[PDB]
Design an enzyme around this catalytic site. Sequence first.
Site, PDB file in Angstrom:
ATOM      1  N   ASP A  54       0.719  -1.289  -0.088  1.00  0.00           N
ATOM      2  CA  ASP A  54      -0.031   0.000  -0.100  1.00  0.00           C
ATOM      3  C   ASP A  54       0.769   1.223   0.044  1.00  0.00           C
ATOM      4  OD1 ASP A  54      -2.617   1.319   0.334  1.00  0.00           O
ATOM      5  OD2 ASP A  54      -1.757   2.106   2.064  1.00  0.00           O
ATOM      6  N   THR A  87      -4.888   3.983  -3.921  1.00  0.00           N
ATOM      7  CA  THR A  87      -4.007   4.652  -3.296  1.00  0.00           C
ATOM      8  C   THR A  87      -2.740   4.481  -4.073  1.00  0.00           C
ATOM      9  OG1 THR A  87      -3.318   2.623  -2.308  1.00  0.00           O
ATOM     10  CG2 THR A  87      -4.776   4.388  -0.887  1.00  0.00           C
ATOM     11  N   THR A  88      -2.070   3.188  -4.365  1.00  0.00           N
ATOM     12  CA  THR A  88      -0.679   3.329  -5.232  1.00  0.00           C
ATOM     13  C   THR A  88      -1.055   3.666  -6.580  1.00  0.00           C
ATOM     14  OG1 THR A  88      -0.324   1.419  -3.835  1.00  0.00           O
ATOM     15  CG2 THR A  88       0.860   1.553  -5.906  1.00  0.00           C
ATOM     16  N   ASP A 358      -9.330  -3.111   4.186  1.00  0.00           N
ATOM     17  CA  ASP A 358      -9.660  -2.633   2.557  1.00  0.00           C
ATOM     18  C   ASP A 358     -10.666  -3.402   1.846  1.00  0.00           C
ATOM     19  OD1 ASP A 358      -7.581  -1.136   2.996  1.00  0.00           O
ATOM     20  OD2 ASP A 358      -5.980  -2.254   1.792  1.00  0.00           O
TER      21      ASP A 358
END
Lengths: 491, 491
Positions: A54, A87-88, A358
């Site tokens: 992450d 995110t990434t 998540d």
Amino acid sequence: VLPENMKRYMGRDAQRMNILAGRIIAETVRSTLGPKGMDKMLVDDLGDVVVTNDGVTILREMSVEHPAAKMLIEVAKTQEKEVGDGTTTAVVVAGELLRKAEELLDQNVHPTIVVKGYQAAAQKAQELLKTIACEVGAQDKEILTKIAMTSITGKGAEKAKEKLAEIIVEAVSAVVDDEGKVDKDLIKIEKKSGASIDDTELIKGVLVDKERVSAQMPKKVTDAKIALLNCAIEETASEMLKDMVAEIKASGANVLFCQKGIDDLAQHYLAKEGIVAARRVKKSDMEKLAKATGANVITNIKDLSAQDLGDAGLVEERKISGDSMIFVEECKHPKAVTMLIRGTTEHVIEEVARAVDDAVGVVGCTIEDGRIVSGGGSTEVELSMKLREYAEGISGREQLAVRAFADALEVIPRTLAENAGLDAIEILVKVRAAHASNGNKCAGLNVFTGAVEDMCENGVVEPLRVKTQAIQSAAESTEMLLRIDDVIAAE
Amino acid sequence: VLPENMKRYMGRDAQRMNILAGRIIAETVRSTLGPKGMDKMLVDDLGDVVVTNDGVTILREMSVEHPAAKMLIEVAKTQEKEVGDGTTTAVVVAGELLRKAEELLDQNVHPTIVVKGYQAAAQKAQELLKTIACEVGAQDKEILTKIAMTSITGKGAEKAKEKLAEIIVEAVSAVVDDEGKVDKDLIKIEKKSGASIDDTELIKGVLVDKERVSAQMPKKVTDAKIALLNCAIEETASEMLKDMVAEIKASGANVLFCQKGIDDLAQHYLAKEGIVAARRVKKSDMEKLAKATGANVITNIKDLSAQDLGDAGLVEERKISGDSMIFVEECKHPKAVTMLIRGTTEHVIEEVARAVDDAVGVVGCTIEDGRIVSGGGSTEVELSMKLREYAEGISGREQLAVRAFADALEVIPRTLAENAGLDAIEILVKVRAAHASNGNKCAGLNVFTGAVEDMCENGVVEPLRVKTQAIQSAAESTEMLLRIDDVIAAE
């Protein structure tokens, strides 16, 4: 004029540093991006070893110096708070946007023009996603497990993404209640070493890491009458202390969770009355237990009455990995559930615990907003195509920034293929042509086949919010970054 | 971007360091592995000398730097908590798995492929063990002593593994109760220098390291009435203090264990009433005494009544190595027993005390789960053979990792023979051929004969859990390790 110790960057040096700073972060995290991406080991100042992929976690743990890299993190944190996933992915394309944006400034395109181009392309990119956005059943079992599983993949835990999807979809759908907003606090993430990841299990009730305070108390209670007192069961003199226990009994309560301590004399009186109890209970656990059993949290012990008691069909002390824990289950109308994560090592149940947190997020996203999009880079290809067309409709100088924006969105399909061991050139030749002709739900790259396929038909989908919020926050940060020509930092 | 002092490893350097780190631990501990293995001397920061062969103990005492070596320890700690045995053995094969795994990455086999191969081979390895797993009587005397003895071997104490097996099998089987789960806390490990290891003895009751608080109190009580008070026998004024003692007498109690202190005046009153007593009793001892005698732990002295008294057939003060200790024995229904470890030196009774703790563990394992496997490397040979066959059924790239996994399991038979003074080459030629033909219960290496034999018929067996949990935890750790390509550690 400025004090010795204050530092300053300006002009192309400020902009060069700013673009390089953001680029470094994007280049660092993109190595975990994709099914064939790798993992990172984050070790703190004490030696504590964390295993993750992450980007956000990585950026929160790392200590950044450059303001530009700090602003990209702020995007990554908003992406976390707002969506949870993407995110990434969002960080990577942001670095590319900045990488190319610098050339436009080098080409004497005023930063406000590049900003206008990105602002225009992003506004159209949102409508494009809304145009291809697929409406699905908010509580549809199938698509909820498809969202869940695709989010789970790329992790060591994906071997059990089917069991994990079933667990999370079950837990979430229940705690959603109305149509709707889901509170993740109603799904407790508990991890205890032992067994494997397939052995992870959901208990429709509350599992607390507490034990029977006395050897003389029952280890199993059926049709349990739960009392929740935050005041310690400690009173000067045995008569006043006994009164406390006598009221618990009189109320009909036979399970007692005290947020504070219990005097050994009180533990004796409790055990004497056949009342099973646990002291020093966490406030959070006192709350989950109230929500599960429907117990009414009582402050003063004297105030506790029979009407304040919560119900549990079974309250039982069980050992997991040797540790004694209490299962409060089969409650009348539990508003809270507990997911117990199993695995063969502390770090396994650690990362799995992160993975399923998540999974709850992204399933909740799909239920809250019933729009999803095709994954495998199909959307990004849609956007590249239509934004290249729009660029012509935009004209002037802004077209150059709009053209570059559309191209920059391609870095993601490109990085996925690179990590997948595929030639991004040959991929894009086939994927882009196949996409434009066949559509959006009949494209994207299957990195597991090594060829363009139907991502949507293959169950490779992600929530709309992922893609749309990523564009919003990322575009604004890079447009702002471009606006700063001069940074003054005090020590 | 990162602060000065933060360190980072990446790529093959990260993976090289990680594989070397785990390898170093495995190469360090494998020297104690086997009947002909040696012992280690662990000396702390004060000069305290510890003698052991246990990999876990060694890893808990040593101070590790590398995260990779820390993760291997986490496996060793789970192996300890879950099974107790298989500690040293599990670490060794883990190092080999990593040693070979690096070559596969060097051969351009994607880490996810090596992970897939190990994941596949380990999943089949479990079914293979379950296929050859031998079901035995949970409380069978014979096999319980066979498990016990084989665990004991390789230690200086093995000279008395027959007496030790009888002692531990006796103590455990009793405290198991139901079918079932055994609590090791019901078997106290006491060590007192004097005599030898054959003189170690089990007392079906509780032995505490306490003495008669007054010279005027009896040194022997028959048909003892034990009172357990955690409140100190100390009251302002002699009348109120006397009342305390008067209630103990009136209750019929004549043995008194006080968790806290006793006022000298109270010791006088106690001695006057013919009540024998000991003060400052450890909470643990107050608990074991309650479990032994069936005494009810009383908080307030005033609350003590005749119905709260526990029974002991004999309570007597005896000297061991000069030290005065109390034996509480011949209780009605003692739920707790005490094993007194004897030996000619402090370090002898120390290591023996560790050896018999493990013996309780492995006997409890056999009773809790009535499946065992043939030792002497016979299982590992079974796995090597069938996994070599499976590798062909696996195909693709994953076969290479599955082939290497099966081969890596051979490092254990190999290390045993090396330490045994045998040529591992000649051993494996005869053992492997003899195993494949004769079966699983008609193989393994007898390091005491220097030839392949029947380990099962020779009583050389270990609990199934040992072998199966070792594969689970070890395989997951090495698969995770391989996944990390980049580690960032703060100072």
